[PDB]
Amino acid sequence: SLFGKYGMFRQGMHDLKVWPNVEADGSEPTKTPGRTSSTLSEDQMSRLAKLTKAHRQGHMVKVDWLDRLTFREIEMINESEKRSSNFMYLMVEFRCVKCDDKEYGIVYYEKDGDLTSFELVK
Amino acid sequence: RAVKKLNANILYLCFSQHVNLDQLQPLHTLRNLMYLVSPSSEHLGRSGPFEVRADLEESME
Amino acid sequence: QKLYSRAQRHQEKKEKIQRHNRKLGDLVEKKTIDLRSHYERLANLRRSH
Amino acid sequence: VEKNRKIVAENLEKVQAEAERLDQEEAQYQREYSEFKRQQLELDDELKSV
Amino acid sequence: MSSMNPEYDYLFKLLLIGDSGVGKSCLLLRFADDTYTESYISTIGVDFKIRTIELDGKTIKLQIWDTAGLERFRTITSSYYRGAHGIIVVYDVTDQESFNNVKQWLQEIDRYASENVNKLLVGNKCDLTTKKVVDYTTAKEFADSLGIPFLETSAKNATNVEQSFMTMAAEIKKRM
Amino acid sequence: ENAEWESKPPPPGWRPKGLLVAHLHEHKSAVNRIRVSDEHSLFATCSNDGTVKIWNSQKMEGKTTTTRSILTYSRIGGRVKTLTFCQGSHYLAIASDNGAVQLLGIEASKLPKSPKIHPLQSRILDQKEDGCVVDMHHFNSGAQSVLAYATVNGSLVGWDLRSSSNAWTLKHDLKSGLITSFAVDIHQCWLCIGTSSGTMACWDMRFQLPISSHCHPSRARIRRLSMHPLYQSWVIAAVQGNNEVSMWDMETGDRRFTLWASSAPPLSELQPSPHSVHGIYCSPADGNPILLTAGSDMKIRFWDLAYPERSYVVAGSTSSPSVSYYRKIIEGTEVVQEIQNKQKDTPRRGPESLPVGHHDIITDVATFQTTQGFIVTASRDGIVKVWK
Ligand SMILES: Nc1nc2c(ncn2[C@@H]2O[C@H](COP(=O)(O)OP(=O)(O)OP(=O)(O)O)[C@@H](O)[C@H]2O)c(=O)[nH]1
After folding, report:
1. Quick check: E32 and E51 in contact, CB under 8 A?
2. What is the DSSP string of E32-73?
3. What residues form DSSP beta bridges with E58?
């Protein structure tokens, strides 16, 4: 989806799960969804991938000693998952908008987005 | 202070021996002791938990 | 084969652990009875004193 | 080659199905043992108290 | 005056970055642990080996972070560069794509790293002379055009690797 | 940056003299836990008798004639094993051996009305699927106030008391033993689970993944776990036997500091001493962390990790011979060993002074501070004593 769960346009790098042997489906809801929402079975790889990225951007607390061990654990999980889930992941990156060095987010809004009882009009 | 401490000690002993709370008076020193060391005190000598009655705690305050 | 041998050891461990708990439960009950007697003795000795 | 591969795969699947069943039973044993272990730890503390 | 420690007169945060499968992990293993293997586990997140060295009689504790080379573990922002004292950009001499992207990494370093960060291009997989496709002059013109230190190394045929970490430490010491 | 291990650090130079201040024997069975409120105005104790009792810590200062439980909750049923106060002293969590966990609100009703406790939220764990609660701690991430509790089936669940949803769920490997205790980092980044088989498993809470699993060489049961107040990667685990309290750095797995208060040869893996540490309290003090430990040896011992020579017994049997503590390095672990000095009429006013110590295993230790710092200790015979 081009707009997120809160109407914000996607930003940064996003890894989309590629469904093998099927054309990309545009119906709503898509039969070949790239971003598996949290409502379905939480793929430990998908949850950890989001966490690794959240860490890279500096959105997670850095604990040097924990990181060496935790990231090493993530490496083992990702290595194990890559061996059993042979699914390919295609990376897509969306452009970012900057003005005066500030990043702006595009939010879905309609151009026209900005009396029930009458005494005489029946 | 000494009399208060003694009365507190007697009351504490009465509680430890499960003395009948209806016979205990917070200001009666020897009367409480007489009921405690009374041959009729059925719980005198028990080893177990005991509760200090809020009414007896409040009566000392 | 290794899983079967582990499974056999676990079956032994379950019965073994069950027995250890049963022995302790009876021993605790017995020591509780002896303790009850001890408290009665203490109470009687105290009452006499 | 295909027939032999199919036979070997079938045997591997049968042996793996038994392995998964044993693993579930082993997990159940750990659960029950945990309950007995809690009791054992409780009794040891109780016995020392008595 | 300030508090200091005898275990290291200086602590240099190094940082290995570069596309996937270039050799970032093996450089770290070959330097820190004199270790090598053909078995590839794709680095995720961060790794943090240590080697303590003496240079010019002064003692430098290198702290030599790996980084993810897969894209799916990578983000436009990257806090890993923050506070880095040195940055090592790695390419695989058998992987032209991994060579071309070196400019993209220098774009990353210049955006996030410390303003004085000592870069160092390291041509890993330099044991692959049978498959070398980025050659010394080809890189040296680029590296010299930036003035970044340069070397070619193999963590397989170790010896080049040692000089790569010694070079980084030297260029750091010259700044420190 | 604002790392606070305790809402009220002990006064400087606090050395508990072991003077009994209040003797509370309201519980009918073994007391399982002691907790102090965040405001330090109240503390609570739970017992096998099925009751949870909340006490006003300010009332235990001796200024009141009779100190009894301020509130008595008994609706949880079964044996109440553990309890913990939640930030702001407004919530009390309780667990029973039946598998029932209920959060009761302690309403600080204005005097003279006694506070009323009413069950606010309740959770009933399936005795077949989840089992009973083994240990429980509460940590507030600011947005979610999560109570983390561990079950017999190895499920560690953090119930966010704000949204009633599970903030996080961890599944411990039962092969590592039954969960016996856990500690959560002050920085809330990670938590460590101790087991009955002596395994100490480290869990990263930021990623919610188990990172490392290490087992004690003796495989002895872990009684209490606490994060180290000074070392961010160290966890202090009191292990069954020899009254051993060992601090382990979970990054490398090496035992860095160990206390050996047993008659067995120090660090001896053979035939341990039947005394064990039950309660562990770690305070940074102000750079010299102090640990007070009490256990089946009925002694409350203050071990000073900075000056082990100054460690001493706070409360114990009156006839206890003088003990000296010496620091020695054995097998790479800094071990402070308690050595009993062989003790080689004075007129007594009245009968021989009665022993103020506990007569049964001290099951837990906690501290509260009012005008002075106090240590509260409860024993398996149901007696809770508050010492200054
Ligand atoms: N022939 C040769 N192969 C190497 C050399 N260094 C690394 N490799 C190979 O490349 C693999 C990956 O090395 P890494 O350090 O992980 O490369 P990387 O950039 O870190 O890859 P990621 O960790 O996924 O980012 C190794 O397992 C080796 O197979 C080298 O010096 N010579």
Report:
1. yes
2. HS----S------S--EEEEEEEETTEEEEEEEE----SGGG
3. E55
Tell me how far apart the alpha carbons of residues F106 and F122 are, in angstroms, rounded to a whole number.
15
Cβ-Cβ contacts under 8 Å for B35 (sequence gap 6 or more)? B14, B19, B20, B23, B24, B41
Task: Name beta bridge partners: F19.
Answer: none
Helical packing angle, A44-56 and A64-84, nearest 10°: 140
* C-alpha torsion E81→A50→A89→E78, nearest 10: -10
Answer whether E38's CB lies under 8 Å from E27's CB.
Answer: no
Q: Which two tokens stand for residue A75?
A: 């490496």
Structure tokens at F210: 């188990």
Containing B2, the helix (H) or strand (E) segment is helix B2-16
What resolution in angstroms, rounded to 1 decimal?
A: 4.5
Amino acid letter for position F267? L
- Residue F51: phi, psi to the nearest 5? -120, 150
Provide residues of E within 8 Å CB-CB of chain A: 41-48, 68, 71-80, 82
List CB contacts of A76: < 8 A, sequence separation 6 or more.
E41
- The span from the CA of F284 to the CA of C28, in Å, is 40
Closest CA to F298 of F370, F356, F374: F356
According to DSSP, the residues that pair with E12 across neighbouring strands are E62
F381·D49 Cβ contact <8 A = yes
Partners of C20 on chain D (C-beta within 8 Å) are 40
Residues in B touching F65 (Cβ below 8 Å): 4, 8, 57, 60-61
Give yes or no for B11 touching F (CB within 8 A).
yes
Counting atoms of ligand 1 from 1, which one is nearest the CA of E124? 31
Structure tokens at F161: 């008391």
Q: Please state how this structure was obtained.
A: cryo-EM
Torsion angle, alpha carbons of F157, F158, F160, F166, to 10: -40
The closest CB to that of C7, out of D22, D39, D43, belongs to: D22
Bond preceding residue A20 cis, omega within 30 of 0: no
Q: Which two tokens stand for residue E9?
A: 């007169």
Largest CA distance in chain C: 71
F79, F96 contact by CB (below 8 A): yes
Residue pair A9/A105 in contact (Cβ under 8 Å)? The answer is yes
Distance of CA B46 to the CA centre of its chain: 14
Pull the structure tokens for residue D49: 């108290």
DSSP 8-state class, residue A9 = B
For residue D29, give every residue at least 6 positions away whose Cβ sits within 8 Å of its Cβ, in sequence order, or none: C10, C13, C14
Phi, psi dihedral angles at F140 (to 5 degrees): -105, 115
